[PDB]
Structure 1
């Protein structure tokens, strides 16, 4: 069922309402379920999934929102959701606090205010740690800045806030670097952005020349210490964790992340000759094994 092309630009914004205090509330339903995923045609991986897909749903909210994630375990092992973000210890999704792990058939609502703004992620933190992550229990968590709380960077914040006219000008994509050890010997056999090896070689990502591009880039790769992103023929600005509104790194073409690191890349192909522009890990073996894709820059 998983569609890596639709996944690129799918934002789950939840069912929105207003709390008695006036605070915006966003509610999400997440079910852990054991399910086959196809990481290449005829390559079946037995995954543990959030909502039947790997990566899990890309959750996207605004700084200051109240977030409720109704988590139900319909799997066979205990699971949690550990968010990278600010929240109480009892909402941290680790085995030793709060409700602990959520056992098969049980439910729990993670609830917190969405801080800090930036690019984040969530993943299972069960026993043992590496197993539940590698099996597929990870996803993206994006907290848009509230432009009313950043007057000194108003234009930047508005460009990131989903649905403003300024944000509609941007071409936004979410990319989770992941990998799979199909024979379960703690070494990856397949690498990818968004699970399907070479998916963006088979169908390049169409890019309109005149508009800028923003990527929310997350490293969920297990076993290997780092992953990386190299943009052919062009340079980008990098925002580590996306937690600042000015770049961490200006004018680079290769960055690296250990697992759990992530950030925002911004660049533009304005004025570029139309054609295919490659992007891939600069660990060459990862790129050969599926972590390589093409932007199709059109005029």
Structure 2
């Protein structure tokens, strides 16, 4: 009975980081309490100044990742401040009943609600806004993130051996549908409401104008690159609430991957590219063996390089000539 369990309070952090948590734990079930505040805002999503009339959990695309253990209860307070214009709610794919909690969390600007559900299944799960009659619009405008439900005894390989990560990153991939006017330039809207009609028209073509990681072209590149070092194991959580994607680490692999994102199933090993179904989150582990800059991208290369679905991981450490060596550098072809 959930009423009798101990409560904990978790402080969320902004993507691409994930809040501190244990993997395997000696702890028993708890009611883990979280709070999120919705923020509607205009965001610049590319390097030429295009804006999106966006909608977010906690001010970020994606929303923050929530981490619990299997058998915990998630207790979320969702706040919709009066400065917003639209009603919102939340649908947790990790939850059972009431359209994922959406029917129980309908909040108009100025309102809040608290939902509890039992996280009875391990895996990474999408959560997203789903207001009746406007579901796709709120999702493509930015209202999604991940709930990770870890097995109480941590991650396991196909033979039941322990797996772990030393750091976790969360990447949300967003297919955007920005309208254009008769001059072929992207439209800039004064309000969220004014963007709706034109956006629906672009959506129905099924062709995104942009496909971005974490809300913007280059959000995870250069100074914003993810980091690691040789010998460190990273967990890359990848969510796509609306459209398929195919993650790939250039120069690396998915050592252990749950592409459907559900940890009670055996992972696959040695993947070059994996597949995240629209409406899901998946998870890959990789242990770095070489230093350098890696590209982490959607391997539809047009979607990555032209539309925005690409980031970087900068890795410290010692180069390994056994794994790879330039035997002969570029030089004139012998005559």
Scaled to the shorter chain, the TM-score interval is: 0.7 to 0.9
Q: Does 2:174 match 1:143?
A: no
Q: Superposition pairs for residues 1-299 of structure 1, below 5 Å?
A: 7-11=15-19, 23-40=29-46, 42-74=49-81, 75-87=84-96, 89-90=97-98, 92-94=100-102, 97=103, 99=104, 101-126=106-131, 127-147=133-153, 153=160, 155-156=162-163, 159=164, 170-183=166-179, 184=199, 185-186=202-203, 187-203=207-223, 204-220=225-241, 222=242, 225-236=243-254, 237-244=256-263, 247-270=266-289, 272=290, 274-288=291-305, 289-299=307-317
On the 8 A contact 1:93/1:124 being kept in 2, the answer is: no
On the 8 A contact 2:65/2:146 being kept in 1, the answer is: yes
Tell me the TM-score normalised to structure 1 length: 0.79
Structure 1 residues 25 and 131: alpha-carbon distance in aligned structure 2, compared to 1, 3 A threshold: same
On the 8 A contact 1:119/1:242 being kept in 2, the answer is: yes
What residue ranges of structure 1 are gaps of 5+ in the alignment?
A: 14-21, 160-166
The whole-number CA distance in structure 1 between the counterparts of 2:68 and 2:310 is 29
Q: Tell me how far 1:262 sits from its aligned partner.
A: 2.0
What residue ranges of structure 2 are gaps of 5+ in the alignment?
A: 1-12, 22-27, 180-198, 318-335
In the other structure, the counterpart of 2:320 is: none
The whole-number CA distance in structure 1 between the counterparts of 2:143 and 2:14 is 19
SS of match in other structure, 2:237: strand
Paired residue total: 266
Structure 1 residues 69 and 154: alpha-carbon distance in aligned structure 2, compared to 1, 3 A threshold: farther
On the 8 A contact 2:87/2:106 being kept in 1, the answer is: yes
The whole-number CA distance in structure 1 between the counterparts of 2:112 and 2:213 is 31
Structure 1 residues 45 and 66: alpha-carbon distance in aligned structure 2, compared to 1, 3 A threshold: same
Structure 1 residues 283 and 148: alpha-carbon distance in aligned structure 2, compared to 1, 3 A threshold: closer
On the 8 A contact 1:12/1:58 being kept in 2, the answer is: no
The whole-number CA distance in structure 2 between the counterparts of 1:113 and 1:252 is 32
Tell me the TM-score normalised to structure 2 length: 0.71
On the 8 A contact 1:37/1:53 being kept in 2, the answer is: no
Q: Tell me how far 1:65 sits from its aligned partner.
A: 1.7
Structure 1 residues 227 and 242: alpha-carbon distance in aligned structure 2, compared to 1, 3 A threshold: closer
Structure 1 residues 252 and 78: alpha-carbon distance in aligned structure 2, compared to 1, 3 A threshold: same
SS of match in other structure, 1:210: coil
On the 8 A contact 1:91/1:110 being kept in 2, the answer is: no
